[PDB]
Design a binder for this molecule. Structure first.
Ligand SMILES: Nc1nc2c(c(=O)[nH]1)N[C@H]1C(S)=C(S)[C@@H](COP(=O)(O)OP(=O)(O)OC[C@H]3O[C@@H](n4cnc5c(=O)[nH]c(N)nc54)[C@H](O)[C@@H]3O)O[C@H]1N2
Ligand SMILES: Nc1nc2c(c(=O)[nH]1)N[C@H]1C(S)=C(S)[C@@H](COP(=O)(O)OP(=O)(O)OC[C@H]3O[C@@H](n4cnc5c(=O)[nH]c(N)nc54)[C@H](O)[C@@H]3O)O[C@H]1N2
Ligand code: SF4
Ligand code: SF4
Ligand code: SF4
Ligand code: SF4
Ligand code: SF4
Ligand code: SF4
Ligand SMILES: [K+]
Ligand SMILES: [Mg+2]
Ligand SMILES: [Mg+2]
Ligand SMILES: [Mg+2]
Ligand SMILES: [S]
Ligand SMILES: [W+6]
Ligand SMILES: [Zn+2]
Ligand SMILES: [Zn+2]
Lengths: 569, 429, 269, 80, 50, 50, 126
């Protein structure tokens, strides 16, 4: 087909466009030089044109997500929907798969990544992906508590660990090396945890620091498009900012070597809000977000996403088993758990972030500090660790908060507990993000760090025709005083194109194509690879509960496979 | 005689994936490693009816038709119903189950699986209090206390103990000798015969017994000197065994889902397991029955948001076990048509439900002759999953394993039948 | 202002009619009331397809009195989330009568199905016959249940009445089966008849009074002694009661169970 | 002449005996771990066609472990 | 509990059964006839017989 | 109190191949002298002599 | 005699359902009632004798059989199937799950015959 988007104010930070009236030309799914004048014209006049949104960190497909769906029928009853032409669905904080895809598209998102996939449960993730419409996607296999990973790194055998990763990435059709509470979830297999990056789990005798550094070497030896994706030890603990700063330094002398894309950072640290806590207990608790922001500003090896508190009743779901039990022990609410043999753990607990409550008030402020005190938006991504800190449907509200210090002050001086002012600096910060900087943290930074900025996160020629048009006129609209207009216009996009096909018109879904599954294809020395694959199968016969032949994901589960090349022989 | 190894067994929720099939001339004639039940499903027993072709009853005698005519009659029934019930699902693969949900939306149906006569009570329990589980390999490699509460694995999950208890694991290299085995059952089952501790409690008193165990666990004296026929001192000793575990697993089954209290028996079992984790690592696993009952609940949940007893009558999905369950719609005479796929409610529902199935149109996607096919008005024989057709199944603790097609069949698969049926139901509206 | 709904033959496929409540009738003529949406299975139908309608309208819900002059044993959700006015049912009802109501009064002169007064916030429900399970309960998964209002069953009820209760008052003048007050956090339940078993199971707070016999009780309750002539939430009950605190399977539990001394001697330790 | 003896008509094919057997375990890591052998290995017995089936009785040391792991007396050590 | 040789005479002679001993059959891995001894000071009436 | 004295008929040595042992417990049950046993790990994740 | 009826799985009923509900194998394995030897004495029956089972919810005829898995006093066991589901409690207590286990029933000897599978289903007047 052919499309041309006319007279829209274009915001594309990867190509230096900062709200310039400019036409975008689309053909057969790509953005092109121009088109014949029989092209269908989309009048974006008086409206903002951005690339399709790219979510680097969401919990949307797989076992832990579906437990949250299953064991919260009351979350479904709060928010059940059925619109003509669409599938039925429900779930306010943990939406069903069709609903998940619909709601990402409505707010202009075309690509979102599943953040924590247990390898033995990979078929489950991909099956939900198939029932997730529109968005392209990928899943992050978990490595930070894997028995092969711990055994190989403790043997000093980084090369063998790299071959195992190559096999696992291919066998699970995964995309990044995700690290969640290294060693601590293995320790939770006995009802324990680790504390700090120098505290090993039982038997395996390898510290979190060694896991982080070993896995960052693997990542770059395999030339993966993304970096290691790190969820630090000691999540949610007063005084954990010291653990977090030490975790950031572990791999910073390793040089990034991606074979595909333009990633120039070796560490991606996710939902850093939960890792920026000062004090020693909940009673002397304070925000240490300025120290974290200062580190991010002064260092050029790291990208972060925030994990902003939306101040809702939501659901927590992480591969951080012991943390979730600790949460259940605090609020008393229903607790799910799943220790996965040889691989990982997980847990699910509802949680209510009331603005009137002191700690959630500070936590809200900590995320705002991280957004506003980090000077260069090229290092930060907008997230809520969906749904841990809030559902992704709240991203437009986070945007509005960042573009309007009046919106923030309304909350701070009204509902917000006074600890937001007493234990944080959010109230002294009057910075407001610009439409360009918003575009940067919702599309460009994530696309680049993920290694997909060739085709995603930008409107330049050669990209995929993933386009969003929002009904905002930047020459007319005041984002500071009209913050509610911003939130609503970013929640219901005027028009969204997915690979050159219109899928949303005026906030409503009009087409549901299946998206692509990106995964990482890597090649490793045949001799090493054979040696590892012999040891792996031998361990399956002894210790796994399934036969080796049945473990890898069959091609039936990737109807629309999109391999991305890492290292090649 | 081709040997097919690494076959996944399509019977029980243990979902053994190490079956070896003896294939002699596009037919399965024997197995290796499969238990006596598993072997029975893989192998045809002489004299048993296997439906070659579709059927429709006219005068109490069935008449052979084509797939198209039988699917057309079936789609006609569903499309003009005002409260159609689509029940079963647990013995077919997940793609067929997913078409079923889209069909249930189109038809405005109630879609429900066998959970509503099985671990549905466990589903209701876990929605209220949570779900602390692990996978089989963790039990195998870590567990030193194993508990079978109200289940009889020797008879219903025959290889479950050998795979999880006698098995030697990384931190349990002595196998059976490294594990304390507890069975809780009013009967001296063949499972209880292997146990180190058999709590032969009074029937229908588990809830009372677990109330005493929980209260003793939290440091409270037990009011009565005998609970559920178990002496006070023996209850305190049992609780001490659980507190001293390095890794405990609680397997449980129909003894507490079917007995007095139902979902509240599971409720209180779950909360004890949760609270045990302040003293010892503890988890539970429900002994899911059919090899892919867990799969239907997975699929339904992720597509609609709810696991079973899902009503699409209003467009939005709505959920109320006790109203929108299969036995509720039949016993209250709400349903005016029943579609049965991969299940035998004729054999396995109570008489009050059977009384309603006799009054309404009944459609059966069934390969064999059952009590359900006796109550049926249309019969549609499919290809059997894990023998003649492939697709995903979910083990009892959520592990997805792809069933395998061992032999060829001229018959249609469940997924194919439903896809054509769906298309015709759309039409008839 | 009285508005009469006279049922035609009830269908085997039940009706759902949450729009039968003063809040919806207010401001509408008799004819507009006839065009009101109700569900008939997977079909939306008009109220007039199953009810004759007569009477005088009114602008305000406080002033409307709906009279269902017949048996609607197969009609669900009558009075759901009503806030004012009155409904009188001269016959039986199906499930969810008064579910989530905030005010007004509902009288069922016959029997009511399960989930009568589920998630009640305020108002009165009076059932002159029997009720099913889950009188005054919560919804699946939600740990926040009924928080106000009063329900009265003059006959018997069944299982899990008062499930996850968090306020309000339930009175059963007859007998109940098992597990009244399961997971109760707050409120008051009075059972003037008997209980088969599991009164107060896993309760964390609130008060349960049984004036008849509990056949079985629970080892997790501590015995506190005997109190005579007690008054709970404006309800006075003469005579002596055994007093129990629990359910101490739950952490921090403060629930109270009172059981008449006459019929429960076997329950004392 | 005490030796192994099966009663396949009493057997559930549950596999307890195959796994418990130290001879089987020594020879097959899969058996040792509670799995039926998939690799071709020569062990004392397996479950075949749904029932225990002695294959290499010459390897049996008549220790009685398998016997004590069966609750239905489907495998015994006795005079032959 | 170090000096204690677990003869069990206190446990027999306690008039109110306040002393409990965790008896066991020895093994080469646990070569002791008992693993613990305890006094329930809620029951003890301090007669000094033990 | 070193009150029991014993002398044995034979002198010798016991040798165990831990990796060949499959822990079927036969020898443990057979030993008339209680020499052999299956130690329990003191801590989760701790391994013992088979 | 008033007994408690428990129902559930047996390995033989499992083998029978996967061979065929139409085979005699299924009647022999699921149209039975397992009883303790001592209960059969007090009632004057032996293995193979047929038993009339009456409950509040229906009636059925099953063949008596000595239980190899011993039962507590006062309990009998009928394997899951259409014969067992003639007499167990249907009501779900608003959970959707019928009460399949532990149901008060009356048992008496009978010279009446055990109905096979197609014949038993005729009682529902299809
Ligand atoms: N009295 C009593 N009654 C009970 C129970 C009890 O304990 N006691 N338990 C209850 C429980 S827990 C359950 S789940 C039910 C049993 O639930 P059911 O589902 O009724 O059990 P089955 O008889 O195995 O039914 C499976 C049917 O599907 C057919 N089938 C096999 N493979 C396929 C396939 O690939 N495709 C299709 N379309 N069909 C296939 C089989 O031939 C068989 O007839 O019984 C319930 N009823
Ligand atoms: N042979 C065979 N195997 C099967 C099936 C089959 O039909 N046949 N179907 C499969 C299915 S669908 C399922 S759900 C599983 C079910 O497998 P199980 O959960 O083992 O089901 P049951 O054998 O019905 O009941 C188990 C035990 O509960 C005990 N019980 C009864 N009442 C009480 C009580 O009050 N308290 C306690 N603690 N125990 C009680 C019974 O004595 C019985 O031994 O089996 C699966 N496997
Ligand atoms: S256990 Fe269940 S699964 Fe494994 S074989 Fe026996 S029957 Fe098939
Ligand atoms: S023998 Fe006893 S144990 Fe070995 S299989 Fe047959 S039953 Fe299971
Ligand atoms: S006796 Fe000892 S050896 Fe012979 S089989 Fe049974 S177990 Fe293996
Ligand atoms: S203490 Fe009691 S047991 Fe220990 S030695 Fe003195 S007396 Fe014997
Ligand atoms: S003092 Fe008297 S009572 Fe207290 S323990 Fe010693 S003996 Fe028993
Ligand atoms: S246990 Fe004793 S007998 Fe059994 S194998 Fe090890 S050594 Fe041989
Ligand atoms: K067969
Ligand atoms: Mg949900
Ligand atoms: Mg683990
Ligand atoms: Mg609830
Ligand atoms: S099941
Ligand atoms: W089942
Ligand atoms: Zn995380
Ligand atoms: Zn995350």
């Amino acid at each position: 087909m052919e499309y041309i988007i006319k007279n829209g104010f274009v915001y594309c930070p990867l190509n230096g466009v900062d709200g310039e009236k400019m036409d975008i030309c689309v053909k057969d799914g790509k953005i092109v030089e121009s088109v014949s004048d029989s092209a269908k014209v989309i009048d974006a006049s008086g409206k903002i044109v951005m690339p399709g949104g790219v979510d680097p960190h969401s919990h949307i497909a797989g076992a832990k997500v579906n437990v949250g769906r299953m064991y919260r029928p009351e979350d479904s009853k709060r928010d059940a929907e059925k619109f003509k032409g669409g599938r039925a669905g429900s779930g306010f904080s943990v939406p069903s798969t069709f609903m998940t895809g619909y709601r990402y598209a409505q707010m202009g998102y075309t690509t979102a990544m599943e953040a924590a996939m247990p390898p033995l449960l990979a078929r489950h993730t991909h099956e939900e992906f198939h029932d997730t419409p529109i968005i392209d996607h990928a899943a992050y296999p978990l490595f930070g508590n894997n028995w092969f990973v711990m055994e190989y790194l403790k043997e000093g055998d980084v090369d063998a660990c790299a071959a195992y990763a190559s096999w696992l990435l291919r066998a699970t059709k995964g995309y990044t090396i995700k690290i969640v509470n290294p060693a601590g979830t293995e320790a939770w297999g006995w009802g324990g945890n680790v504390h700090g990056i120098y505290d090993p789990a039982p038997y395996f005798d390898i510290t979190p620091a060694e896991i982080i550094k070993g896995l960052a070497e693997v990542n770059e030896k395999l030339q993966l498009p993304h970096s290691i994706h790190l969820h630090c030890n000691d999540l949610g603990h007063p005084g954990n900012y010291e653990t977090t700063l030490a975790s950031f330094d572990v791999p910073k002398n390793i040089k990034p070597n991606p074979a595909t894309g333009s990633r120039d950072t070796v560490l991606y640290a996710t939902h850093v809000q939960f890792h920026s806590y000062g004090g020693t207990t909940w009673r002397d608790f304070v925000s240490e977000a300025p120290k974290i922001a200062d580190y991010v500003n002064k260092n050029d090896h790291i990208v972060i996403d925030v994990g902003q508190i939306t101040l809702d009743e939501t659901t927590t779901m992480t591969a951080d088993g012991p943390m979730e039990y600790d949460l259940h022990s605090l609020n008393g609410l229903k607790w799910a758990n799943c220790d996965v043999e040889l691989e990982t753990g997980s847990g699910v607990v509802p949680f209510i972030y009331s603005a009137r409550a002191p700690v959630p008030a500070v936590q809200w402020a900590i995320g705002m500090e991280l957004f506003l005190l980090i000077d260069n938006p090229e290092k930060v991504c907008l997230t809520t660790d969906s749904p841990n800190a809030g559902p992704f449907t709240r991203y437009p509200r986070v945007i509005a908060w960042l573009m309007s210090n009046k919106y923030r002050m309304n909350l701070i001086e009204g509902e917000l507990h006074k600890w937001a002012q007493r234990k944080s600096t959010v109230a002294t910060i009057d910075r407001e993000y610009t439409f360009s900087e918003i575009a940067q943290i919702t599309r460009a930074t994530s696309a680049k760090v993920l290694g997909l900025s060739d085709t995603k996160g930008h409107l330049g020629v050669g990209a995929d025709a993933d386009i969003a048009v929002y009904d905002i006129n930047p020459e007319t609209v005041d984002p500071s005083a009209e913050y509610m207009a911003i939130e609503e216009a970013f929640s219901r996009a005027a028009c969204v194109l997915k690979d050159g096909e219109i899928v949303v018109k005026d906030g409503e879904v009009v087409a549901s194509p299946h998206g692509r599954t990106y995964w990482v294809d890597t090649q490793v020395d045949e001799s090493i690879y054979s040696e590892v694959l012999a040891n792996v199968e031998s361990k399956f016969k002894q210790y796994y509960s399934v036969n080796f032949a049945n473990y890898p994901v069959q091609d039936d589960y990737l109807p629309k496979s999109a391999p991305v090349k890492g290292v090649m022989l | 005689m081709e040997y097919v190894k690494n076959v996944v067994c399509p019977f029980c929720g243990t979902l053994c994936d190490d079956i070896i099939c003896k294939v002699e001339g596009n037919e399965i004639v024997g197995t290796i490693n499969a238990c006596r039940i598993g072997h029975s499903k893989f192998v045809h027993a002489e004299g048993a009816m296997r439906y070659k072709k579709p059927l429709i009853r006219k005068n109490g005698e069935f008449v052979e038709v084509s797939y198209d005519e039988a699917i057309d009659k079936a789609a006609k029934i569903l499309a003009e119903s005002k409260r159609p019930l689509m029940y079963g699902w647990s013995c077919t693969e997940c793609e067929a189950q997913a078409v079923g949900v889209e069909l249930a939306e189109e038809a405005g149906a109630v879609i429900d699986n066998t959970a509503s006569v099985c671990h549905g009570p466990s589903v209701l329990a876990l929605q209220d209090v949570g779900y602390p589980i692990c996978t089989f390999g963790e039990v195998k490699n870590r567990a030193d206390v194993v508990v079978y509460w109200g289940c009889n694995p020797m008879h219903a999950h025959p290889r479950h103990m050998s795979r999880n208890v006698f098995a030697r694991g990384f931190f349990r290299e002595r196998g059976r000798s490294d594990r304390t085995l507890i069975v809780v059952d009013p009967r001296k089952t063949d499972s209880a015969k292997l146990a180190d501790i058999h709590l032969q409690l009074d029937f229908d008193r588990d809830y009372e017994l677990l109330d005493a165990m929980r209260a003793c666990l939290l440091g409270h004296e037990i009011l009565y000197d005998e609970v559920a026929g178990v002496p006070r001192e023996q209850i305190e000793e049992a609780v001490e065994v659980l507190k001293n575990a390095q890794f405990g697993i609680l397997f449980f089954g129909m003894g507490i889902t079917h007995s007095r209290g139902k979902h509240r028996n599971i409720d209180t079992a779950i909360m004890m397991v949760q609270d045990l984790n302040d003293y010892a690592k503890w988890t539970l696993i429900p002994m899911r029955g059919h090899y892919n009952v867990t799969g239907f609940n997975q699929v339904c949940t992720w597509e609609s948001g709810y696991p079973y007893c899902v009503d699409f009558s209003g467009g939005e999905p709505r959920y109320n076990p006790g109203e929108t369950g299969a036995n509720d719609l039949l016993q209250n005479r709400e349903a005016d048509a029943m579609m049965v796929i991969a299940s035998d409610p004729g054999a396995h529902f109570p008489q009050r439900a059977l009384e309603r199935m006799a009054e309404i149109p009944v459609i059966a996607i069934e390969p064999h002759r059952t009590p359900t096919t006796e109550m049926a008005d249309i019969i549609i024989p499919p290809a059997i999953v894990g023998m003649e057709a492939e697709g995903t199944a979910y083990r009892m603790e959520g592990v997805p394993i792809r069933m395998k097609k061992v032999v060829d069949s001229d018959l249609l698969s469940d997924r194919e039948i439903l896809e054509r049926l769906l298309e015709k139901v759309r039409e008839y509206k | 202002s009285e508005i009469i709904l006279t049922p035609k033959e009830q269908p085997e496929v039940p009706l759902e009619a949450p729009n039968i409540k003063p809040d919806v009738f207010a401001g509408k003529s008799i004819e507009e009331i006839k065009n009101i949406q109700i569900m008939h299975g997977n079909e939306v139908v008009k109220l007039g397809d199953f009810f004759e309608v007569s009477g005088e309208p009114a602008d305000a819900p406080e002033d409307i009195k709906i009279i269902i002059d017949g048996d609607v044993y197969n009609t669900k959700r009558i009075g759901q989330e009503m806030t004012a006015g009155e409904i009188i049912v001269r016959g039986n009802v199906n499930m969810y009568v008064g579910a989530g109501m905030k005010g007004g009064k509902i009288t069922v002169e016959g029997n009511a199905g399960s989930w009568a007064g589920q998630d009640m916030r305020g108002g009165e429900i009076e059932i002159l016959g029997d009720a099913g399970d889950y009188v005054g309960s919560s919804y699946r998964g939600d740990w926040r249940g009924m928080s106000g209002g009063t329900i009265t069953v003059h006959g018997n009820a069944d299982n899990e009445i008062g499930e996850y209760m968090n306020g309000g008052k339930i009175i059963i003048k007859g007998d109940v089966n098992i597990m009244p007050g399961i997971h109760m956090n707050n409120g008051l339940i009075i059972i003037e008849g008997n209980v088969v078993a599991r009164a107060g199971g896993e309760m964390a707070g609130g008060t349960i009074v049984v004036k008849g016999m509990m056949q079985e009780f629970l080892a997790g309750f501590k015995y506190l002694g005997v109190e005579k002539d007690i008054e709970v939430d404006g309800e006075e009950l003469p005579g002596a009661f055994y007093k129990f605190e629990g359910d101490h399977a739950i952490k921090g539990a403060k629930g109270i169970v009172y059981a008449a001394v006459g019929c429960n001697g076997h329950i004392a330790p | 002449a005490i030796g192994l003896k099966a009663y396949p008509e009493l057997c559930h094919g549950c596999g307890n005996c195959v796994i418990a057997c130290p001879v089987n375990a020594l020879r097959s890591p899969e058996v040792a771990g509670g799995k039926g052998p998939t690799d071709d290995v020569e062990i004392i017995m397996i479950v075949e066609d749904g029932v225990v089936n002695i294959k290499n009785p010459d390897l049996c040391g008549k220790c009685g472990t398998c016997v004590e792991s069966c609750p239905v007396d489907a495998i015994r050590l006795e005079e032959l | 509990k170090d000096t204690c040789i677990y003869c069990g005479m206190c446990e027999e002679m306690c008039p109110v059964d306040a002393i409990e001993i965790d008896h066991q059959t020895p093994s080469s891995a646990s070569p002791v006839v008992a693993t613990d001894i305890r006094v329930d000071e809620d029951k003890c009436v301090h007669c000094g017989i033990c | 109190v070193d009150a029991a004295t014993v002398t044995k008929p034979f002198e010798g040595e016991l040798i165990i191949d831990q990796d060949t042992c499959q822990a079927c417990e036969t020898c443990v049950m057979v030993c008339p002298c209680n020499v052999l046993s299956f130690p329990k790990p003191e801590k989760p994740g701790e391994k013992t002599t088979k | 005699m008033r007994v408690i009826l428990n129902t559930g799985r047996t390995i033989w009923q499992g083998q029978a359902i996967e061979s065929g509900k139409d085979l005699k194998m299924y009647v022999d394995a699921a149209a039975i009632i397992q009883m303790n030897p001592e209960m059969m004495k007090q009632l004057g029956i032996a293995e193979g004798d047929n038993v009339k089972v009456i409950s509040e919810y229906g009636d059925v005829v099953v063949k008596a059989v000595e239980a190899k898995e011993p039962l507590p006093e006062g309990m009998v066991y009928i394997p899951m199937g259409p014969w067992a589901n003639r007499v167990i409690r249907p009501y779900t207590d608003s959970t959707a799950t019928p009460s399949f286990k532990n149901i008060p029933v009356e048992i008496i000897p009978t010279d009446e015959e055990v109905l096979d599978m197609p014949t038993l289903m005729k009682v529902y007047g299809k």
